[PDB]
Structures are given as C-alpha cells and as structure tokens.
C-alpha cells in the first residue's frame, strides 16, 4: 500500500489477472504530471521515430 502516495514519481504496475494472463498495467512517464503530453510513454516514442 506504499507507493500509492502519488507525491513521488509514477511507476508501471504489473498485474496478474484472473481470467487472463499477467497484464501490464502502467504506461505514464515519470513526469508525474497531468498536462504535459510527456506521460503515456508511446507519445514520447512516437514522436522520436518521426524525428528519426
């Protein structure tokens, strides 16, 4: 129940599900922040390949 304090930076949780497998449960970058489009890790990486 620690790390549930969202005062330090975010994580990526990994969860084992019941009727399906161990499902990945986190994609939100350590910009622990609500407005910059630099959480949601795929957004960080989608641009970078276009930059590439």
């Amino acid at each position: 129940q620690a790390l549930l304090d969202n005062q330090g930076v975010s994580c990526n949780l990994i969860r084992s599900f019941v009727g399906k497998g161990v499902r990945l449960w986190g994609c939100r970058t350590l910009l622990n922040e609500e407005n910059t489009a630099w959480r949601y890790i795929q957004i960080r990486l989608l641009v970078s390949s276009v930059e590439h």
């Binding site: 790390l3 330090g8 930076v9 975010s10 994580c11 990526n12 449960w25 622990n32």
Partner: protein
C-alpha cells in the same frame, strides 16, 4: 502511483408513487362499547 480503469458503476431511480389522500377517511371517536387504548385511532376492516 498507478490506477485501474475504474469501471464506475452507478444507477438511477423511479417512484412518484405517493397517492394516499386519507382526507376521505372517517374517524369514529366514541367511547369503548363495553382492551383498546383510550386514545388511538383504530382502522376498521368491516363490521364483521
């Protein structure tokens, strides 16, 4: 720091149903014909 989809269940309601109008109800306020209270109104199904 993480979070689940939060499926967020709720529901709504119904029921205006209130209808009574017990103004048309009479009250017989006599003495006891000779173990009721001395004070309470008592409903009557029938004379039977």
């Amino acid at each position: 720091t993480m979070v689940l989809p939060g499926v967020s269940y709720n529901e709504t309601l119904l029921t205006q149903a209130s209808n009574d109008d017990p103004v048309t109800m009479p009250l017989f306020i006599g003495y006891t014909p000779p173990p009721v209270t001395v004070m309470q109104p008592v409903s009557v199904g029938s004379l039977t």
